[PDB]
Structure formats: structure tokens, C-alpha cells
Amino acid sequence: PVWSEPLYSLRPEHARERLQDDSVETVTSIEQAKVEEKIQEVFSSYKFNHLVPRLVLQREKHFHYLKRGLRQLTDAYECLDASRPWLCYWILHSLELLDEPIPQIVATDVCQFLELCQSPDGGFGGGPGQYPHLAPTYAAVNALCIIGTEEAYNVINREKLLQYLYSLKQPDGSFLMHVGGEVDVRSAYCAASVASLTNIITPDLFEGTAEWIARCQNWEGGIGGVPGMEAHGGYTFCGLAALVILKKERSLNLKSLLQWVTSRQMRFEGGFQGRCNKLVDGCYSFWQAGLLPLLHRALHAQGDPALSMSHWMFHQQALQEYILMCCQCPAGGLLDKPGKSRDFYHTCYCLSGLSIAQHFGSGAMLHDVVMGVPENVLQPTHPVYNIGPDKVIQATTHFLQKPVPGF
Amino acid sequence: FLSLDSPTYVLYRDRAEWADIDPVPQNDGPSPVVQIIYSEKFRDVYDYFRAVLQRDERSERAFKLTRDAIELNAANYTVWHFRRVLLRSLQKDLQEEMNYIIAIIEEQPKNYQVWHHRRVLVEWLKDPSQELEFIADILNQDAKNYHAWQHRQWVIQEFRLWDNELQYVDQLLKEDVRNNSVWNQRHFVISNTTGYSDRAVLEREVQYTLEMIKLVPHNESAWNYLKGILQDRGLSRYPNLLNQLLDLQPSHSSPYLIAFLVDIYEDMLENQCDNKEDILNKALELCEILAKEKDTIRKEYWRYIGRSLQSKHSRESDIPASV
Numbered sequence: 001p002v003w004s005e006p007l008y009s010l011r012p013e014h015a016r017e018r019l020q021d022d023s024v025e026t027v028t029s030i031e032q033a034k035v036e037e038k039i040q041e042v043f044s045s046y047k048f049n050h051l052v053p054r055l056v057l058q059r060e061k062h063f064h065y066l067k068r069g070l071r072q073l074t075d076a077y078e079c080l081d082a083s084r085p086w087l088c089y090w091i092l093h094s095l096e097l098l099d100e101p102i103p104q105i106v107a108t109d110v111c112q113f114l115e116l117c118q119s120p121d122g123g124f125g126g127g128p129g130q131y132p133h134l135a136p137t138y139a140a141v142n143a144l145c146i147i148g149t150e151e152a153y154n155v156i157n158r159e160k161l162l163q164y165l166y167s168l169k170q171p172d173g174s175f176l177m178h179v180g181g182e183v184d185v186r187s188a189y190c191a192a193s194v195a196s197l198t199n200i201i202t203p204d205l206f207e208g209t210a211e212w213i214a215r216c217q218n219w220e221g222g223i224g225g226v227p228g229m230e231a232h233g234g235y236t237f238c239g240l241a242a243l244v245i246l247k248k249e250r251s252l253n254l255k256s257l258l259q260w261v262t263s264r265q266m267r268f269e270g271g272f273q274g275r276c277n278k279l280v281d282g283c284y285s286f287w288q289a290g291l292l293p294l295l296h297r298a299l300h301a302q303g304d305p306a307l308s309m310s311h312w313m314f315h316q317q318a319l320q321e322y323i324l325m326c327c328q329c330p331a332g333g334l335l336d337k338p339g340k341s342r343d344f345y346h347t348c349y350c351l352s353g354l355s356i357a358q359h360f361g362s363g364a365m366l367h368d369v370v371m372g373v374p375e376n377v378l379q380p381t382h383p384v385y386n387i388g389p390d391k392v393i394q395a396t397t398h399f400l401q402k403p404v405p406g407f
Numbered sequence: 408f409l410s411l412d413s414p415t416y417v418l419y420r421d422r423a424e425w426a427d428i429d430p431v432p433q434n435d436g437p438s439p440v441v442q443i444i445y446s447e448k449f450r451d452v453y454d455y456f457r458a459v460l461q462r463d464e465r466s467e468r469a470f471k472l473t474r475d476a477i478e479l480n481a482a483n484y485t486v487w488h489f490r491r492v493l494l495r496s497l498q499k500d501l502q503e504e505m506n507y508i509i510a511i512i513e514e515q516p517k518n519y520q521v522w523h524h525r526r527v528l529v530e531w532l533k534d535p536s537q538e539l540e541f542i543a544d545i546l547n548q549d550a551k552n553y554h555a556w557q558h559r560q561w562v563i564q565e566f567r568l569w570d571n572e573l574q575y576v577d578q579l580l581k582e583d584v585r586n587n588s589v590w591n592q593r594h595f596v597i598s599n600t601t602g603y604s605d606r607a608v609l610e611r612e613v614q615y616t617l618e619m620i621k622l623v624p625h626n627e628s629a630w631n632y633l634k635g636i637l638q639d640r641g642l643s644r645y646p647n648l649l650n651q652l653l654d655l656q657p658s659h660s661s662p663y664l665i666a667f668l669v670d671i672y673e674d675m676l677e678n679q680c681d682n683k684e685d686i687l688n689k690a691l692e693l694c695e696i697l698a699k700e701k702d703t704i705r706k707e708y709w710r711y712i713g714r715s716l717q718s719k720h721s722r723e724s725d726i727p728a729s730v
């Protein structure tokens with residue numbers, strides 16, 4: 001009807017979803033209310049200005065921001081000087097989602113740079129001359145598969161990369177992030193991602209890894225960084241994505257995990273929190289909502305007959321609403337929440353989540369949902385590697401025509 | 408010594424005691440990608456760091472240089488590895504190194520390497536005697552700092568420091584009953600000390616959590632805790648719990664109580680309860696109340712649950728097709 005509001009965040013009922021603090025004020029509730037107050041200004045801004053809402057993804061603005069950062073960053077990024085393959089992966093993957101070609105001159109310069117970040121003893125480091133580390137190693141292998149040229153694939157020293165991985169493997173089944181480093185579930189995801197993309201998985205590489213990851217699922221149904229720690233979206237994506245790679249998702253209690261992640265969507269704001277009783281953040285649009293296609297595929301692999309054949313099990317509309325209305329910066333780039341500044345990290349994962357929420361697919365069943373103008377539609381992303389599905393196929397098909405090192 | 412923020416700080420290229428060393432520029436290649444336009448101070452420190460690292464110079468001046476490098480980027484794990492090499496080679500006082508790390512964590516506590524380094528010191532010294540109080544200070548400024556709580560769990564478990572943690576837990580729930588890290592810490596302490604299989608502890612914990620729910624009925628952490636400690640034995644193995652929650656329905660209701668009732672029903676149906684079809688209808692009704700009115704953000708979830716329940720617990724579900 002004509003009194004009907006199509007935007008979920010703007011309906012009158014939606015006011016009822018505001019925080020109920022039971023007249024018990026604590027820091028958690030105060031901080032939650034402050035965000036809901038700021039978000040409500042965003043939602044009401046159309047009404048108060050007497051405009052009709054248009055939800056427009058500022059493609060041209062983000063492209064300019066991405067295109068330039070791929071070449072040069074301000075000293076604001078000194079804090080990421082040991083994460084430069086990450087900057088490569090985030091920017092390349094945002095451009096990919098925005099369906100922006102990667103010039104063959106940019107592709108080869110990236111290849112030359114990650115080559116300089118590669119360690120003579122396997123793995124990649126956060127920059128040239130740095131020691132290797134599983135996190136810049138996962139990012140470099142991803143960025144190299146996004147380029148996906150013959151040149152890009154050959155940067156990877158597969159023989160040494162497998163040597164590096166073995167040197168971090170722990171007896172309880174976990175991995176170190178780097179030599180002398182810490183152990184948490186990020187290393188399991190990082191190791192399995194590069195190892196499966198490049199085809200270097202051996203029969204004993206991940207012995208006991210599935211079992212270690214499962215010990216990280218706690219009483220909440222999510223996954224903590226190490227056994228006993230609070231469940232978090234980033235660790236839970238890492239933990240479940242790693243098991244999907246290892247074909248061991250059934251090690252987890254998938255029901256209590258599904259129940260956990262769907263409760264991390266915020267009834268008012270529409271995006272996701274990283275953990276119970278914390279604040280909404282646009283980057284969990286990927287880390288949390290990305291967990292639902294992985295869950296969908298696992299339960300469908302067990303013949304769960306009740307699965308939807310058209311939607312993920314979260315509020316896809318509400319999440320696109322939050323990203324489009326709240327996480328876009330008018331100069332380009334996306335961001336955490338209104339009032340925070342932009343950065344390539346949130347740019348990558350706000351758009352990765354937007355893409356997840358836009359595209360459902362389980363076999364031949366495809367169904368898209370594009371809030372706002374139809375040009376907002378992004379390229380699909382693969383929910384295990386968060387690189388374009390075409391790039392995963394192209395990379396694995398390439399590396400499967402090599403032998404696993406040592407045969 | 409000269410602190411990185413000192414007004415009289417001088418660049419390393421201007422220091423006479425560094426004149427023998429040639430700095431090493433970053434090897435970024437002929438046409439760089441993602442090139443950061445470093446400040447003078449930053450590029451200066453890391454040019455000289457690259458040099459000592461390339462030599463493997465295990466000198467006192469190098470040890471002081473890694474302090475400056477760490478303050479400019481405390482996520483540089485390479486600089487941290489070298490600092491630990493120098494700590495052992497130069498035989499540095501590790502309590503003086505602990506005074507350093509308590510300070511660095513104070514100023515940048517949201518970072519992986521600072522906390523890992525503290526853990527290595529504690530293992531080297533085999534001395535946890537400062538940990539619980541220091542962590543308590545970090546938590547007094549951010550009661551939800553993930554690395555702080557991870558570090559606290561390691562110290563407690565590795566040095567068997569369980570004695571006073573449930574009391575610390577109780578203090579922080581008093582301060583913020585919505586602090587989900589504290590509910591998790593509460594489950595950690597019990598899981599490793601008495602366990603929840605002791606019937607008195609479990610009862611005490613359920614009584615405690617209900618008392619909390621009664622006070623802040625929309626606090627989701629108390630609800631998740633209550634489900635977590637009971638879901639392992641099976642929510643239907645506690646017959647009284649259902650009626651007790653229904654007794655909160657009028658004056659303490661939330662979507663969290665509605666959802667718990669669906670959870671009890673789901674498990675009752677999975678355990679072949681009496682009035683099977685009656686229970687299935689109560690559950691299906693709550694799923695639609697939650698999907699349509701009470702918890703609409705999760706409509707795809709509650710609808711999926713309603714289909715799951717119908718799929719395997721309807722009276723027709725066990726019945727052959729030909730019937």
C-alpha cells in the first residue's frame with residue numbers, strides 16, 4: 001500500500017526494537033543506547049529532511065578511494081606496516097566485488113611486491129624483509145589468486161610454503177601464527193586456506209586440527225580464539241571455515257552455533273555485533289553473516305529438509321540497510337559505524353558482507369535480493385576464502401595440475 | 408636513552424653513536440603497490456632497524472632501538488622477535504623488561520604481540536605473582552578486552568590460580584551484569600574447578616542466574632549462560648524449569664524467554680515427551696510469534712526452526728507415504 005514503508009529500518013514498528021535497559025544502567029547499556037541514538041538520527045534523517053530514501057552504493061567514490069590506496073597510503077597506515085599483503089588483499093578484493101578490472105600493470109607490480117614479501121624459508125611477511133607470518137601469508141595467497149594470472153600463481157613457493165606450515169604445527173593440532181608467536185584459531189584457518197588453494201595438503205598436515213578447533217566452541221555455541229575464551233565472530237568464521245576446508249564441520253555442534261550467530265544480528269541497527277552485549281560493526285557483516293552460507297551448506301550436506309531454498313538464515317534486507325545507510329563514507333570507503341572514519345579493512349568486509357546478503361545460492365537454486373537501486377549489486381564472494389568464486393575454481397584447478405610437494 | 412615522544416628526541420641519522428652504521432632502506436621494488444608514505448621519525452627508526460637486523464647486531468644500542476620501533480608499530484612481530492633475541496643474548500634483566508611491558512600494554516592494550524611477549528616473560532621468569540593484579544588494572548579501563556581475558560585464563564590455568572577468581576567474577580558482574588566476558592570467565596572457573604556435574608554447584612548457578620534474569624530480564628548474557636549450563640544435560644531433563652519460566656512470562660517477558668521456551672519444547676520433542684502433538688503446537692505458535700512479532704530480525708531462523716519441528720515431530724512424520 002501507499003502508507004507502507006519498504007525499508008525495514010524505517011517502518012513504525014521498528015521503533016519498538018530499541019534497547020530496553022530495565023531501568024538498570026550499566027556501561028554496556030549506556031554504550032548500546034548511545035549507538036542506537038546515533039543510528040536513529042541516520043534512519044530519521046530522510047523523514048526530518050522530507051526526502052524520499054534512496055539507498056545508493058557510492059561505487060564511483062569507493063573506486064577512487066580503492067584505486068589510489070592500491071598505490072599509496074598516508075602515514076595513517078604506519079600501524080599496518082607489518083600487514084601490507086593485507087592491504088593488497090582488502091583493496092584488490094573490494095575492487096573485485098565492485099567489478100573493477102585489475103590492470104595488467106597493477107597485477108604485475110603486485111606480483112613483484114608479494115615476491116619481495118615472500119620468505120626464503122616459506123610463507124610471506126608483512127612487508128619486504130620481514131619474517132613470515134600466517135596472516136600476511138593468507139592475505140598474499142588470496143591477493144595472488146584474485147589476480148589469478150599465470151605470473152601470480154608462480155610467485156608462490158609451494159615446496160617451501162609447506163615447509164613453513166609444518167614448522168608451525170603444534171602437537172595438540174593447533175598452529176603458531178609465526179615462529180615464536182601465539183596460537184589461536186586464526187592460524188588454523190590461515191594454514192588450511194593457503195594449503196587447499198595451492199594443493200599442498202598432505203595426509204598428516206592437519207592431524208588433530210579439526211579436534212583442536214572443536215575444543216574452541218564454548219558454552220555460547222560460537223568459537224573463541226583458544227579453548228575457554230569468549231565466542232567471537234572473527235574466530236567463529238575462522239573455526240567453521242577451516243573445518244569446511246577439512247570436511248570436518250560435523251565436529252562442531254552446528255545447531256548451537258547457528259543459534260549463536262543469528263543472535264548476533266542487532267534487532268534495531270540491522271548489522272552484527274562481534275560478541276554478545278557489544279556494539280554493532282560493519283565488518284561483522286562478513287565475519288558473522290558469512291557464517292550462514294557455511295552453515296547452510298553443512299546442514300544441506302546432512303540432508304536437513306527444512307532449509308530455505310531462497311534465503312540465508314539472517315535478515316538479509318536489514319543488513320543491506322545497515323551497510324548502505326550507515327557504513328558508507330561520502331568520500332569513498334566504508335566503515336564500522338556512524339562516527340568512525342573509513343579504512344580499507346572495513347571497506348573490504350562491509351562490501352564482502354553486502355555481497356553475501358545480496359546473493360543466495362544452494363546448487364541450481366539462486367535468488368538475489370538487492371536493496372536500493374539495482375546497480376548496488378556486487379559480484380559474489382566465496383564464503384570460505386572471501387575471494388570471488390571464479391577465482392577459487394581457477395586457482396584450485398591450476399594447482400591441482402601440480403603434484404603435492406614430495407609427492 | 409631517549410623516549411620516542413620526548414621533545415628532545417633526535418633522529419637516529421643525527422646520533423653520533425650511530426655514525427658507523429649505514430641505514431638500510433625498505434626494499435619496495437621499482438614501482439611499489441600499497442606504499443605507505445612514512446613520517447620522518449618512522450622511516451628513520453625502521454631504516455636503522457633494518458640495518459641492525461641484517462647484521463644480526465646483538466648490541467645494547469640495538470636493544471634500545473627496538474623499543475622505538477615497537478612504539479611506532481607495536482604490531483611488528485619481526486621487531487618483537489629480535490627484541491627477545493637481544494633479551495637473551497645480552498642477558499637483560501627480565502623484571503626490568505616486565506616493567507617495560509606493563510607500560511606498553513597500558514598504552515596499547517588492543518594488540519596481539521604485547522600480550523604474547525608478556526606471556527613469554529612470565530614463562531621465562533616462571534613468576535605469575537603480578538599477573539592477576541595487572542590484568543585487573545587493564546580490565547578496570549576496558550572490562551571486555553579480549554587479550555586481557557585470554558591472558559588471565561592462561562595465567563590462572565597454568566599456575567593453578569583458581570582460588571579467588573569466582574570472587575573476582577562476582578565483583579565484575581556486580582559492576583556490569585551485561586559483561587559477557589565475565590559470564591564466560593564464570594563458566595571457565597567452574598568448568599575447571601568443580602564442574603557443573605556437582606548438583607549443588609549447578610543448582611547454585613541456576614538460582615543465581617534466574618535471580619539475575621529477574622533483575623535485568625532483557626540482559627541476554629544471563630539467558631545464554633542459563634542455556635549453556637543446562638543444554639548439555641538436556642533442557643528437558645529439568646522438568647521444573649519450564650513452569651518456572653512461564654511464571655516469569657507476565658512481568659519479566661522478553662524475546663529471550665519466548666526463545667528459551669521453544670528451546671525447551673524442541674528438546675522435549677526430541678526425547679519423546681507426553682502430549683507430543685500438544686507440545687509441537689505450542690512450539691510452532693511461539694516460532695511464529697517470534698518470527699512475525701517478537702523477534703522479527705531472526706524471521707528466517709524461527710521459520711526454519713518451525714519447519715524443522717514440523718519436519719520430524721508431526722504425527723504424519725513417522726507415517727508412510729501410502730498411508
Ligand SMILES: CCCC[C@H]1CN(c2cccc(OC(F)(F)F)c2)C(=O)CN1Cc1cncn1Cc1ccc(Br)cc1
Nearest residue numbers: 080083086135186234274281283284336342343344345346
Ligand atoms: C585499518 C585497521 C583496521 C583495524 C582492525 C583490523 N585488524 C587487522 C589487522 C591486520 C590483519 C587483519 O586480518 C583480518 F583482516 F582481520 F582478517 C586484521 C586489527 O588488528 C584491528 N582491527 C580492529 C577492528 C575493527 N573492527 C573490529 N576490530 C577488532 C579486530 C581485532 C583483531 C582482528 Br585480527 C580483527 C579485528
Ligand SMILES: CC(C)=CCC/C(C)=C/CC/C(C)=C/COP(=O)(O)OP(=O)(O)O
Nearest residue numbers: 135186232234235238274275278281287553
Ligand atoms: C586472520 C583472520 C581471518 C582474522 C579474522 C579474525 C577476527 C575478525 C578476529 C577478532 C579477534 C578479536 C580480538 C576481536 C576483539 O576485538 P575488539 O574487542 O576491539 O572488537 P569487538 O568489541 O567488536 O569484539
Ligand SMILES: [Zn+2]
Nearest residue numbers: 281282283336
Ligand atoms: Zn570492525
